[PDB]
Design a binder for this molecule. Structure first.
Ligand SMILES: Nc1ncnc2c1ncn2[C@@H]1O[C@@H](CO)[C@H](O)[C@@H]1O
Ligand SMILES: Nc1ncnc2c1ncn2[C@@H]1O[C@@H](CO)[C@H](O)[C@@H]1O
Ligand SMILES: Nc1ncnc2c1ncn2[C@@H]1O[C@@H](CO)[C@H](O)[C@@H]1O
Ligand SMILES: Nc1ncnc2c1ncn2[C@@H]1O[C@@H](CO)[C@H](O)[C@@H]1O
Ligand SMILES: [Mg+2]
Ligand SMILES: [Mg+2]
Ligand SMILES: [Mg+2]
Ligand SMILES: [Mg+2]
Lengths: 210, 209, 210, 209
């Protein structure tokens, strides 16, 4: 593929996709005067670059397949310490700080498989300096027996804004009437392909890959 | 920081004056050249290793950068924490191309030497480096005020050296090798990011991942 | 099966099994003048009453079978923190203190299934106050791929005394010409039936059930 | 502490003057008697619960027994740490026998009350106590110079009370109930062990497990 010297032109150089880009400050401004409310965040590639653990999981539990994601031992390790090697995202630092400034209730809603113990809530509160009153234990959402879905949890907790990188984060928000705001998945994530951020006409946060 | 800073089309089209290259263009520039020794930095060149460096910082020096001079950290980093390091696609392509050429592959890292190391095995395994092309990782260390890599480039007759940092490129310059820059990922915990192209060197496109 | 009122007689009351009972002091006296040597301990029901974790494992993973002992999640949990609920044995405190007095090297050799990480070595060193120079990482012995057997390890480490509660601990010692010394398995252990301590003519430590 | 203390056959045959009984004997003594309320202590009576207490001591007060007055400990102990508690065989036999009689089964524990508790669920589950025979655990607490259980035994009209500690037996004595002692296991972390039989009460044989 690729010609050796493909070149370019200035129309291509300056070309922008029609996406509603926003900054943290602009989101904050859009909420000016609104009292404390509930908001939520996806975890993986939204607030934590957790590919280090998923990568190690792939290699360890299914080097020749994709079954690690349904492997209960993987989930034990991933939810009880491998996030010490996850890299918090600066965009999430700024968003979480902004929502703490607002006095908002902060929820983390994940599609990770649940384990009876998890240290992810502690990692999140500690790394993002989340006070107790704003912090809530991580919600493991899904379809399994005993679970409620992501959208059901958004309704139950009256979450008004949901931040995430995956198309299903945005559509979960859409489905319940919440404001879904997209964060860019880092290009060195092992979760591929990358989503088409902005493809629902949703806001996308600038520079949110790191 | 304005709330609404805006932009303009001069800024949108603006290019820094960088000699961008692709792996294919590098390979083309070597057509007909017989096998040679080539070298690679490790951290943010072939591995996204910030997971272990970040863990190390929190564990060994949460308030300082002392961890980087700490042998207890280096033992961890060099004997298993690279299981969390993520191979870069650019390095897969470069190493495949140079192996296909019959080149000798060397790794010259600023990491400090330890009593044992499993990094050489991690690299040969993950990048599918044939035993004949593979060489044990060279742990050159890092001392303020000196390029600790230059001598090793001389020792191994390395003709092209790939790296993300300024000292990788200037080590190449020092010995008259061809220094080629890889972009450090923006989610690296080694900040600030270097200015790729700062010495007029070639910089590989799309090399952050 | 028993009569409602079985009664007894004084021959039965005074009856003793022909067992070579020893105390920690007697063992120490038997080694007097001998320079530092390697000694080894089994873990379960020898130095730790670990039935709490094994019991939780059985209820959790196989209420109606022994499959929990092959369950990889059980072993992850049992070897990486469930021994916080294991009760150190007083006999092992006294034995380990005695071997540290002698300057002996101390080894723990276990047939627990191996996991990539384990916190058992730390729990043992911490609870039994074992100095660094005497302590050695727990050896997971068995016949899984890559492993060597208990007896092979006693030979490799030149272990001269091996303490344990199970028949296989004593015969491992006998097979390599080491001195195998029996600890009583507590009657509330979930590992049943209880072994016949003394069935090989070996020394059995008094009061060693706790 | 002689190296070689020795023994003699008077010592070998010596018996403490204890009214030992079996579950079968207790059952026989109740034959034909209508359903009644009976009660059990929990700790070292029906559950070997030292795993949670030992974990608590280490977590909350490694130097003292201050953790026993710590409501943060009680929350942990009463809402999941009994997953590590080992049901006693004597209690299986006694509870089965009393359920078979149609008796009401109460648990009166010295543990402190908490906001929530899953101990009742653990007991009904482990001992297969039918819903009709089960009653929610009574958390009587423990205060110096008080028998906190006596009034509960009277309140619930408990006619036989099983327990390992002196307060279990004297609580029965206080209200005219039949107090029956179970042996505390020698590997309990609650020491010293009680003198079973110290009030002339029945003591169940082989009841340490
Ligand atoms: N966090 C994750 N969640 C779901 N799938 C993942 C994750 N990380 C990696 N994978 C998947 O495994 C790989 C299989 O191609 C895909 O790239 C996909 O990313
Ligand atoms: N934050 C950091 N600072 C310095 N070096 C780091 C950092 N993270 C990873 N490294 C790696 O450790 C150093 C060893 O010299 C190399 O510079 C390499 O980039
Ligand atoms: N309850 C139990 N049943 C069977 N084995 C046990 C139990 N508790 C400890 N073990 C033993 O401990 C481990 C160490 O050999 C082995 O799996 C062995 O089974
Ligand atoms: N190891 C223990 N130490 C003290 N109390 C315990 C223990 N295990 C259970 N308990 C219960 O908790 C105490 C609360 O008063 C009672 O003494 C009761 O026995
Ligand atoms: Mg995500
Ligand atoms: Mg580098
Ligand atoms: Mg054993
Ligand atoms: Mg009790």
């Amino acid at each position: 593929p690729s010609p050796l010297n493909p070149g370019t032109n200035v129309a291509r150089l300056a070309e922008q996709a029609p996406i509603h880009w926003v900054s943290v400050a602009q989101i904050e401004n859009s909420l000016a005067g609104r009292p404390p409310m509930a908001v939520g965040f996806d975890i993986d590639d939204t607030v934590l670059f957790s590919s280090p653990g998923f990568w190690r999981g792939k290699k360890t539990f299914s080097p020749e397949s994709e079954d690690y994601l349904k492997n209960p031992v993987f989930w034990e390790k991933m939810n009880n310490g491998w996030d010490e090697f996850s890299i918090p995202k600066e965009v999430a630092r700024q968003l979480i700080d902004m929502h703490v400034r607002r006095g908002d209730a902060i929820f983390f809603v994940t599609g990770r498989s649940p384990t009876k113990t998890e240290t992810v809530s502690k990692t999140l509160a500690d790394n993002f300096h989340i006070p107790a009153t704003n912090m809530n234990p991580v919600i493991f959402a899904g379809d399994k027996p005993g679970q409620n879905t992501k959208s059901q949890w958004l309704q139950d907790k009256n979450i008004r804004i949901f931040y995430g990188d995956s198309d299903n984060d945005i559509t979960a928000a859409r489905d319940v009437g919440a404001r879904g705001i997209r964060i860019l998945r880092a290009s060195n994530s092992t979760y591929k392909p990358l989503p088409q951020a902005g493809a629902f006409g949703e806001e996308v946060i600038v520079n949110s890959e790191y």
